[PDB]
């Protein structure tokens, strides 16, 4: 809403301030060309300094949802949503997100009627095994960029309201401010669900005078 | 005692690039003396092809030629070519929908139902058929 | 108008026997990358 908030001067908070002073302050007509021009810089800064990394990043190399494969997208989702230390999904809504994506992959790459390869989302408690089994059932998806329909579906179910906001930026567009700013508080207390478990990525609200 | 999810095929249209076999396999068929013999600058290769015809694109025409009927991908491509189904992304009747919709009624249509809903129309208005004055200015 | 014409199309795999293994491998890698790029372009352009 534009209200002031005091936060610790972390790398993520400094990125927040830089985007506030260079991107978010721009008008609507200037927002989209600016994001197109500074796509690479924004992606690098999100992947390096922010709690919500650029989603299309495989092996540390910036990509796009269109230039990413289904296996890469599923692996990225597991990496960013499933916590290895606790050996469980951070949120059931996130587990449902990943399972719906896998169901869509199965729909895309199945040639005819078949039983779902993931009957219950509880099978995703071992997400590596689930991904292995589904992408062995449909090996063509391992080396196949995302269908554009599937990209649109991915963005829509990232925008799903009855769901915890995803811990990444899927695309840079008019809704980039929403993706960047929404759900920025829980990361302080749940550093285990951060890329490097680093506070500098997360933003912690604090008082400049009370910090003495 | 009180009170299995089924998955449906979805159209994944492939460009049908040539299969690139392993080098040993591709070398076995050709003569061993061809290596370095030809002037590749003087060898002409068809790197791309396409068409627009009575059965849509080269893909759909090939499907009708070889198998005599459209697969899911071919039927969805023909419906898209003929404008039967348009793509929609965004809110639709309140709930958010992303996929094919009927061009006229705008109602969601699944790839499963594309065949059952448009196979007759595609067959009746594709290929050799009675001349349609609407396609040739009355 | 007596416009007779003939063409002969040979299987592409007979071409790949005229090149080295390394050249064929790099060509295959480039074609795979290009096929992925063309797939995403084609599907985007189809839907939009």
Identify whether residues A50 and A67 lie together within a single domain: no
Structure tokens given for A20: 């506030």
Residues of chain B contacting A142 with CB distance shorter than 8 Å? none
Which CATH number is A60's domain given? 1.20.930.70
Q: Are strands A88-89 and A82-83 parallel, antiparallel or unpaired?
A: antiparallel
Identify whether residues A25 and A69 lie together within a single domain: no
Other CB atoms within 10 Å distance of the CB of residue A72: 21
In three-state secondary structure terms, A89 is strand
In this structure, what are the phi and psi dihedrals at residue C20, rounded to the nearest 5 degrees? Answer: -80, 170
Identify whether residues A85 and A160 lie together within a single domain: yes
Residues of chain C contacting B38 with CB distance shorter than 8 Å? 18
Structural domain total, chain A: 2
* Alpha carbon distances (Å) from B15 to A142, A211, B59, C37, C39: 17, 61, 8, 11, 7
Contact A149 C39 (CB under 8 A): no
Q: Which chains touch C (3 or more CB pairs under 8 A)?
A: A, B
Q: Which member of C32, C37, C47 has the closest CB to residue A149?
A: C47
Q: A122 burial class (0-12, 13-18, 19+ CB within 10 angstroms)?
A: exposed
Residues in a beta bridge with B91: B96
Identify whether residues A114 and A182 lie together within a single domain: no
Residues in a beta bridge with A61: A58
CB-based contact A10:A201 (threshold 8 Å): yes
Domain range spanning residue A184?
1-54+172-212
H or E element, residue A88: strand A88-89
Q: Give me the resolution in angstroms, 1 decimal.
A: 2.7
Residue environment code for A83-108, b if the CB has 16+ CB neighbours within 10 A, otherwise e: eeeeeebbbeebbbbbbbbbbbbbbb
How close A72 comes to chain B (CA, Å)? Answer: 18
Identify whether residues A80 and A154 lie together within a single domain: yes
């Amino acid at each position: 809403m534009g209200e002031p908030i005091h936060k610790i001067a972390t790398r993520g908070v400094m990125l927040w301030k830089e985007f506030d002073e260079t991107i978010f302050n721009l008008p609507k007509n200037k927002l989209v060309p600016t994001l197109e021009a500074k796509r690479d810089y924004i992606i690098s800064r999100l992947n390096a300094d922010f709690q919500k990394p650029w989603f299309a990043t495989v092996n540390g190399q910036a990509r796009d949802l269109a230039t990413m494969t289904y296996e890469e997208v599923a692996k990225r989702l597991v990496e960013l949503m499933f916590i290895r230390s606790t050996n469980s999904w951070f949120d059931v809504t996130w587990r449902t997100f990943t399972g719906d994506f896998l169901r869509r992959v199965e729909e895309r790459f199945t040639k005819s009627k078949t039983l779902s390869l993931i009957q219950s989302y509880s099978l995703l408690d071992k997400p590596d095994e689930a991904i292995e089994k589904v992408f062995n059932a449909y090996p063509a998806a391992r080396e196949q960029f995302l269908n554009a329909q599937d990209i649109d579906h991915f963005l829509s179910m990232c925008q799903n309201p009855m769901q915890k906001p995803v811990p990444f930026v899927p695309v840079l567009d008019r809704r980039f401010e929403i993706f960047f700013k929404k759900d920025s508080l829980w990361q302080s207390e749940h550093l285990e669900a951060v890329v490097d478990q680093d506070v500098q990525r997360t933003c912690i609200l604090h008082g400049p005078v009370a910090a003495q | 005692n009180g009170n299995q999810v089924e998955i449906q095929p979805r159209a994944n249209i492939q460009l049908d690039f040539p299969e690139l076999k392993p080098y040993k396999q591709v070398k076995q068929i050709a003569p061993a003396e061809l290596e370095g013999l030809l002037d590749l600058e003087r060898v002409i290769v068809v790197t791309g092809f396409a068409e627009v015809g009575p059965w849509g694109s080269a893909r759909t025409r090939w499907e009708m030629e070889a198998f005599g009927e459209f697969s899911l991908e071919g039927c969805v491509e023909m419906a898209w070519i003929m404008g039967f189904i348009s793509y929609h992304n965004g809110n639709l009747k309140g709930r958010p929908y992303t996929g094919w919709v009927d061009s006229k009624t705008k109602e969601p249509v699944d790839d499963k139902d594309v065949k059952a809903k448009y196979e007759t129309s595609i067959l009746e208005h594709s290929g050799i058929r009675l001349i349609e004055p609407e396609l040739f200015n009355g | 108008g007596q416009k007779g014409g003939q063409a002969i199309v040979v299987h592409p795999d007979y071409l790949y026997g005229a090149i080295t293994e390394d050249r064929y491998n790099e060509y295959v890698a480039k074609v795979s990358a290009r096929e992925k790029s063309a797939y995403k372009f084609f599907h985007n352009g189809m839907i939009y």
